[PDB]
Amino acid sequence: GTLTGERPPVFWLQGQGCTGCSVTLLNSVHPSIADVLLKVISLEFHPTVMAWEGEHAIEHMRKVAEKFKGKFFLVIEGSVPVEADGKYCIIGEANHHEISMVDALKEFGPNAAAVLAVGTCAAYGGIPAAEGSETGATAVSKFLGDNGIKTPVVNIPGCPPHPDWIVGTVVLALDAIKKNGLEGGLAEVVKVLDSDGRPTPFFGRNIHENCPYLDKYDEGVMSATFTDKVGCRYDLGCKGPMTMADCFERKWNGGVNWCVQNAVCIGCVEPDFPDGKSPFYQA
Amino acid sequence: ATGRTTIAIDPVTRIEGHLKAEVVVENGKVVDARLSGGMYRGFETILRGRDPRDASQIVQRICGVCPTAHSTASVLALDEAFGAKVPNNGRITRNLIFGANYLQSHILHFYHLSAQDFVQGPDTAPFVPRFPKSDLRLSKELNKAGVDQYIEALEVRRICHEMVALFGGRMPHVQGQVVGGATEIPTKEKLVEYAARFKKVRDFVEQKYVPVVYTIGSKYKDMFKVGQGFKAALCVGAFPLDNSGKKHLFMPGVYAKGKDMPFDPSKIKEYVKYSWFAEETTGLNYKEGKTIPAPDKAGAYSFVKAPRYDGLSLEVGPLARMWVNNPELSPVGKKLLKDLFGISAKKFRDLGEEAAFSLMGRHVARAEETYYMLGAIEGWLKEIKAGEDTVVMPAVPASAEGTGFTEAPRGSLLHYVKVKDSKIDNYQIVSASLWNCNPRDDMGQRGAVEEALIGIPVDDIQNPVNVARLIRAFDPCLGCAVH
Ligand code: SF4
Ligand code: SF4
Ligand code: FCO
Numbered sequence A: 001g002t003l004t005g006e007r008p009p010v011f012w013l014q015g016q017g018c019t020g021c022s023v024t025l026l027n028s029v030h031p032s033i034a035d036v037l038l039k040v041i042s043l044e045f046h047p048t049v050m051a052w053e054g055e056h057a058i059e060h061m062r063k064v065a066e067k068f069k070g071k072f073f074l075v076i077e078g079s080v081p082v083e084a085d086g087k088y089c090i091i092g093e094a095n096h097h098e099i100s101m102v103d104a105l106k107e108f109g110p111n112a113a114a115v116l117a118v119g120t121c122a123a124y125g126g127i128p129a130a131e132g133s134e135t136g137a138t139a140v141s142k143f144l145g146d147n148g149i150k151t152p153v154v155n156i157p158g159c160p161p162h163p164d165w166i167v168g169t170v171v172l173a174l175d176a177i178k179k180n181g182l183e184g185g186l187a188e189v190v191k192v193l194d195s196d197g198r199p200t201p202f203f204g205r206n207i208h209e210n211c212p213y214l215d216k217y218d219e220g221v222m223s224a225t226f227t228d229k230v231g232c233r234y235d236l237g238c239k240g241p242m243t244m245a246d247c248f249e250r251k252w253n254g255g256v257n258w259c260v261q262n263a264v265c266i267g268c269v270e271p272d273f274p275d276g277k278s279p280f281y282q283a
Numbered sequence B: 001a002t003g004r005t006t007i008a009i010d011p012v013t014r015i016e017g018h019l020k021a022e023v024v025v026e027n028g029k030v031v032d033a034r035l036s037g038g039m040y041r042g043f044e045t046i047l048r049g050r051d052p053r054d055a056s057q058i059v060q061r062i063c064g065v066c067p068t069a070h071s072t073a074s075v076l077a078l079d080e081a082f083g084a085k086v087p088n089n090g091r092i093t094r095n096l097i098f099g100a101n102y103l104q105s106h107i108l109h110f111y112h113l114s115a116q117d118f119v120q121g122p123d124t125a126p127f128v129p130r131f132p133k134s135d136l137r138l139s140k141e142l143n144k145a146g147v148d149q150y151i152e153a154l155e156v157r158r159i160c161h162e163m164v165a166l167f168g169g170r171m172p173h174v175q176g177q178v179v180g181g182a183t184e185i186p187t188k189e190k191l192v193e194y195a196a197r198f199k200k201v202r203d204f205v206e207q208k209y210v211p212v213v214y215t216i217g218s219k220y221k222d223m224f225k226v227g228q229g230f231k232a233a234l235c236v237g238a239f240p241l242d243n244s245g246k247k248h249l250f251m252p253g254v255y256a257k258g259k260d261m262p263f264d265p266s267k268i269k270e271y272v273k274y275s276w277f278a279e280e281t282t283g284l285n286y287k288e289g290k291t292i293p294a295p296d297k298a299g300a301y302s303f304v305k306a307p308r309y310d311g312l313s314l315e316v317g318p319l320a321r322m323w324v325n326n327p328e329l330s331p332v333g334k335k336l337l338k339d340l341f342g343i344s345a346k347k348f349r350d351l352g353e354e355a356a357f358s359l360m361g362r363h364v365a366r367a368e369e370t371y372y373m374l375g376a377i378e379g380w381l382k383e384i385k386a387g388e389d390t391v392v393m394p395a396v397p398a399s400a401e402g403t404g405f406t407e408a409p410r411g412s413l414l415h416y417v418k419v420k421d422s423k424i425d426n427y428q429i430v431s432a433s434l435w436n437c438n439p440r441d442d443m444g445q446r447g448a449v450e451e452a453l454i455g456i457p458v459d460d461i462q463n464p465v466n467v468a469r470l471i472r473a474f475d476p477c478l479g480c481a482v483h
């Protein structure tokens, strides 16, 4: 990119998130996050990093949204809680009126070019929707569907996702749009999503079938302590067999480690995370 | 002479999580304040019924900026409950995992959250638009140094997360801390990799970060004269330096009404009159804590409970820890205090109570603490033994309890777990930004940041920049505060 190139507007709204999906993106190696912000996208609203604040920040987003109606990208980080008339997540206040996450998604969702549900919470409900919760935490695609909102959704799950999955899905979409225009481009993106809405370049391969300890699994050679790095981690709770992600190859944090080498995979990109992947430390 | 204006800010930006601030301004100064944490998840109820070992993964999702802190508190609570005896080398490995994220978090806070309070960024989103009169005082050269350092700090904080991941697996959300220790023995080769990254971080902290905080501070000397609040602080201890549980890098203590006092955790109670929880749960110590949301309860204004220490409203964080422990100041802090401020100082308390407990004093304390952590990490790199085991594998108990105490980058953190029938019966969390960003208690006493807002200058109601500047000095993380 260039400082002088075309950069589409992005609004990043946090519902029931932990900010981990923003922090993971800050860890992008190639392109660096500086290059993403200055050369790839125009991040017009993001509560963690933007200059302005309060009702002024909300109104700035609304002004951009009107100018780019149908064309902005809406990132959602966290689930959307529907109980108690939306009161479990208030994201702002303007005109003396509080704005719940429910309100915000109903306002901006219909007018986005696409909604990127970043993280397992936004994609599938995640920890806020797990057993023992009581806020009505809802995944983005389900909330939009329940409310008659037809805007395309792309899920980029993980708790957190790898930065390469987030940046790479943006690049996939921008490439498709450059070639085909907005509607033709988004149609080409949808064609490369799996049944759980995940881009197959990143989520189309199984961890276990590509794992370097697979020979030990087949031999029945299982580590009995976490620090034994020779054996397979299945008896310690590894969920690699049920997990679709490319972590075995790209690894984490500049390639320095990944979950299976260090401890176990907990299945963090899967629709049933956490409850269907728990207990974490037994098979 | 002017009358009242009431100013609501939602969202407060360049913090973590969901915060509304409402201040009453009269005659150019804040005279009242209310802070509202506006998002709830309910980790304390989600955790019930699970295998206790799952907690050290689940709890990290309270917050993606500080997950190693919750990981640490959780494994310490599980260690106690299970009777797990962490091997010496595992204690040190944990300190290397967690200490690297102190570096990440403080650098993120100063540059990527706070620095735009004083620095104009480039003329493109997310750096514009902003208040037309933003009170940005730096020369063209020093403003450009701030921008250049903001950009460099994006790389440095990423390198800090590589350091975390070397023995932690990945970051955010480490895999490498469990009950019984750390899951990966450090190898000679990976210790070389950690040290090489650490050198780059050290150089940035010593040469860029600590000097820029004092230098920017010297252009905002008025910001050392406001934001005192209660001038009351808490530290619960963190980073064990041996296997006795009695010696720590940060030692515990309370400071209030000009006096040092011991820390007794039985004196913690969480009040809820002004919080969205059932009235019958007010005033509980964490060992008997309850979390029963009441989002429609009249008069309440926050999902943050109100913790009080023997009735006192205390703050937490780098200022709190550095004031309680009173370490020697960094060489470059000593020099710049003399050169730029005319202050002769050797130890942290030589700043004096008023300047330390101030808006800019909290930024200085955080920079000094970052420098202090460098020496701790250097010591752990000498102490660790490549190849020595870092974990034990304990059986899950049927019936047990435990408490883990540590210091997250933003302040004091404890997790309490009670196990019954081999499952979590209760899990209670009392976190750093809980201590800072809470609402009034049942007696009407304000939370620490609410009180620190009193007296903040608002000479221009149309550009009320100092309200959120004060809030940002405390590095709020509302995901932690509410959980
Ligand atoms: S370590 Fe996990 S992913 Fe690898 S072979 Fe064993 S069970 Fe499969
Ligand atoms: S290895 Fe498993 S737990 Fe780790 S990031 Fe990949 S999918 Fe998530
Ligand atoms: N640091 C941090 Fe997060 C907060 N507040 C915790 O604990």
Ligand SMILES: [Fe+2]
Binding pocket: B044, B305, B428, B429, B430, B431, B483
């Ligand atoms: Fe709590």
Ligand code: NI
Binding pocket: B016, B062, B063, B064, B065, B066, B067, B477, B479, B480
């Ligand atoms: Ni946090």
Ligand SMILES: [S]
Binding pocket: B065, B066, B067, B068, B069, B070, B101, B102, B105, B408, B409
């Ligand atoms: S942390």
